[PDB]
Design an enzyme around this catalytic site. Structure first.
Site, PDB file in Angstrom:
ATOM      1  N   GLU A 233      -9.840 -37.163 -52.302  1.00 43.30           N
ATOM      2  CA  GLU A 233     -10.588 -35.950 -52.661  1.00 43.30           C
ATOM      3  C   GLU A 233     -11.192 -35.337 -51.423  1.00 43.30           C
ATOM      4  OE1 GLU A 233     -12.925 -37.119 -56.285  1.00 43.30           O
ATOM      5  OE2 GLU A 233     -11.268 -35.956 -57.130  1.00 43.30           O
TER       6      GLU A 233
ATOM      7  N   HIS B 138      -9.405 -42.407 -56.941  1.00 41.29           N
ATOM      8  CA  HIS B 138      -8.522 -41.254 -57.060  1.00 41.29           C
ATOM      9  C   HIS B 138      -7.325 -41.507 -56.155  1.00 41.29           C
ATOM     10  CE1 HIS B 138     -11.877 -38.895 -58.859  1.00 41.29           C
ATOM     11  NE2 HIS B 138     -12.578 -39.764 -58.145  1.00 41.29           N
TER      12      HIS B 138
ATOM     13  N   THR C  43     -17.045 -34.889 -58.923  1.00 40.41           N
ATOM     14  CA  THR C  43     -15.786 -34.207 -58.646  1.00 40.41           C
ATOM     15  C   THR C  43     -14.939 -34.001 -59.899  1.00 40.41           C
ATOM     16  OG1 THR C  43     -14.517 -36.199 -58.188  1.00 40.41           O
ATOM     17  CG2 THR C  43     -15.699 -35.166 -56.335  1.00 40.41           C
TER      18      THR C  43
ATOM     19  N   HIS D  26     -14.597 -46.424 -59.180  1.00 41.71           N
ATOM     20  CA  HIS D  26     -13.296 -45.970 -59.621  1.00 41.71           C
ATOM     21  C   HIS D  26     -12.553 -45.395 -58.430  1.00 41.71           C
ATOM     22  CE1 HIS D  26     -15.844 -42.381 -59.835  1.00 41.71           C
ATOM     23  NE2 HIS D  26     -14.759 -41.811 -59.331  1.00 41.71           N
TER      24      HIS D  26
ATOM     25  N   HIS E 176     -14.681 -44.509 -55.057  1.00 42.04           N
ATOM     26  CA  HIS E 176     -16.046 -44.031 -55.324  1.00 42.04           C
ATOM     27  C   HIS E 176     -16.881 -45.112 -55.957  1.00 42.04           C
ATOM     28  CE1 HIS E 176     -14.487 -39.627 -55.337  1.00 42.04           C
ATOM     29  NE2 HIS E 176     -14.663 -40.122 -54.125  1.00 42.04           N
TER      30      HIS E 176
ATOM     31  N   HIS F   9      -8.579 -40.620 -67.001  1.00 45.00           N
ATOM     32  CA  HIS F   9      -8.606 -39.849 -65.728  1.00 45.00           C
ATOM     33  C   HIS F   9      -8.530 -40.724 -64.500  1.00 45.00           C
ATOM     34  CE1 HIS F   9      -9.755 -36.455 -68.156  1.00 45.00           C
ATOM     35  NE2 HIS F   9     -10.802 -37.117 -68.620  1.00 45.00           N
TER      36      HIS F   9
HETATM   37  C1  LIG Z   1     -20.600 -40.399 -62.371  1.00 45.30           C
HETATM   38  C2  LIG Z   1     -19.375 -40.502 -61.512  1.00 45.30           C
HETATM   39  C3  LIG Z   1     -18.094 -40.185 -62.193  1.00 45.30           C
HETATM   40  C4  LIG Z   1     -17.710 -40.925 -63.328  1.00 45.30           C
HETATM   41  C5  LIG Z   1     -16.502 -40.646 -64.020  1.00 45.30           C
HETATM   42  C6  LIG Z   1     -15.635 -39.674 -63.523  1.00 45.30           C
HETATM   43  C7  LIG Z   1     -15.998 -38.946 -62.347  1.00 45.30           C
HETATM   44  C8  LIG Z   1     -17.203 -39.202 -61.690  1.00 45.30           C
HETATM   45  O1  LIG Z   1     -17.532 -38.445 -60.560  1.00 45.30           O
HETATM   46  S1  LIG Z   1     -17.159 -38.758 -59.158  1.00 45.30           S
HETATM   47  N1  LIG Z   1     -15.553 -38.634 -59.015  1.00 45.30           N
HETATM   48  O2  LIG Z   1     -17.726 -40.062 -58.782  1.00 45.30           O
HETATM   49  O3  LIG Z   1     -17.800 -37.721 -58.369  1.00 45.30           O
HETATM   50  C9  LIG Z   1     -14.352 -39.307 -64.239  1.00 45.30           C
HETATM   51  C10 LIG Z   1     -14.058 -40.022 -65.529  1.00 45.30           C
HETATM   52  C11 LIG Z   1     -15.328 -40.464 -66.184  1.00 45.30           C
HETATM   53  C12 LIG Z   1     -16.142 -41.383 -65.280  1.00 45.30           C
HETATM   54  C13 LIG Z   1     -17.264 -42.129 -65.997  1.00 45.30           C
HETATM   55  C14 LIG Z   1     -17.572 -41.694 -67.381  1.00 45.30           C
HETATM   56  C15 LIG Z   1     -16.340 -41.412 -68.288  1.00 45.30           C
HETATM   57  C16 LIG Z   1     -16.878 -40.179 -68.866  1.00 45.30           C
HETATM   58  C17 LIG Z   1     -15.791 -42.155 -69.422  1.00 45.30           C
HETATM   59  O4  LIG Z   1     -16.640 -42.280 -70.489  1.00 45.30           O
HETATM   60  C18 LIG Z   1     -14.587 -41.271 -69.805  1.00 45.30           C
HETATM   61  C19 LIG Z   1     -14.242 -40.497 -68.554  1.00 45.30           C
HETATM   62  C20 LIG Z   1     -15.097 -41.169 -67.529  1.00 45.30           C
HETATM   63 ZN   LIG Z   2     -14.596 -40.131 -58.218  1.00 45.99          ZN
END
Ligand SMILES: CCc1cc2c(cc1OS(N)(=O)=O)CC[C@@H]1[C@@H]2CC[C@]2(C)[C@@H](O)CC[C@@H]12
Ligand SMILES: [Zn+2]
EC number: 4.2.1.1
Length: 257
Positions: free
Chosen positions: A103, A93, A195, A91, A116, A61
């Site tokens: 986002e 986006h 998100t 990570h 992020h 992702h």
């Molecule tokens: C906590 C923030 C977080 C972590 C992750 C994502 C999304 C997340 O939220 S956000 N975009 O920071 O609000 C999308 C992919 C996720 C990743 C970390 C954990 C995983 C689940 C991996 O194991 C496989 C997909 C990954």
């Molecule tokens: Zn994110």
């Protein structure tokens, strides 16, 4: 089976994750004129001098740079936060085109990408328990625009061809996330969610006003990643952003006048 395509993207997520239609979902549009300056906000403290990165992973992702969070290193505190939150990963986006990819939006403006930096509240002992709490995470969001290169990003860009496909990882030590921060720490803050599924409503969002600039060549390399695993049909990892969600009963606060 969630993703970002026509048949499994954001408009579908609510079927497996009903909280998608919840009261504190993210991202949101930040209406800068309605956000209110809050002089009660304590100063914001990003202390990354001892951050120790471990690994970089294509998780299907996005790509994520992971940190050793077993000690009190790399902490976010102050601002809207009570207590101390520890960096676990960052990570991004991004879009298929420079005109989209973020986002959060600012007065409906979409940036080319969004970083992020994810931190968990040390009062809950670890990340998996923290995400079960309404104040479990603090995510520092930083917008990317295309212009001058960000030298501190290049080490990340250069390792991406080694993690082209879902499930590939690579050693990634000694990476200093201070090189990804803009000059100013002026921010907006509001209560929200992850998100991506499971869309848990556990995040205090802190979104910096000042974007960082990255070069066209740097973001082009993000867009060469793949959502698919090795030996599967190539699907470029692009447009892995959730659109803005309803603000509902929430106020966005500004740290600046
Ligand atoms: C906590 C923030 C977080 C972590 C992750 C994502 C999304 C997340 O939220 S956000 N975009 O920071 O609000 C999308 C992919 C996720 C990743 C970390 C954990 C995983 C689940 C991996 O194991 C496989 C997909 C990954
Ligand atoms: Zn994110």
């Amino acid at each position: 089976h969630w993703g970002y395509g026509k048949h499994n993207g954001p408009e579908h997520w609510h079927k497996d994750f009903p909280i998608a239609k919840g009261e504190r979902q993210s991202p949101v549009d930040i209406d800068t004129h309605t956000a209110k300056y809050d002089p009660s906000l304590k100063p914001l403290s990003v202390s990354y001098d001892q951050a120790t990165s471990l690994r970089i992973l294509n998780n299907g992702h996005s790509f994520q740079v992971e940190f050793d969070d077993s000690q009190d290193k790399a902490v976010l505190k102050g601002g809207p936060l009570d207590g101390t939150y520890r960096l676990i990963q960052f990570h991004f986006h991004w879009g298929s085109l420079d005109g989209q990819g973020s986002e959060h939006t600012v007065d409906k403006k979409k940036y080319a990408a969004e970083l992020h930096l994810v931190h968990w509240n040390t009062k809950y002992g670890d990340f998996g328990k923290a995400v079960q709490q309404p104040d479990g995470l603090a995510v520092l969001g930083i917008f990317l625009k295309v212009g001058s290169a960000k030298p501190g990003l290049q080490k990340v860009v250069d390792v991406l061809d080694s993690i082209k496909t879902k499930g590939k990882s690579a050693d990634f030590t000694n990476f200093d996330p201070r090189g990804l921060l803009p000059e100013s720490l002026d921010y907006w803050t509001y209560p929200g969610s992850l998100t991506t599924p499971p869309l848990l409503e556990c995040v205090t969002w802190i979104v910096l006003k000042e974007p960082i600039s990255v070069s066209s060549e740097q973001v082009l390399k993000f867009r060469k990643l793949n959502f698919n695993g090795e030996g599967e049909p190539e699907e470029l990892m692009v447009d892995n952003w959730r659109p803005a969600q309803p603000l509902k009963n929430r106020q966005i606060k500004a740290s600046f006048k």
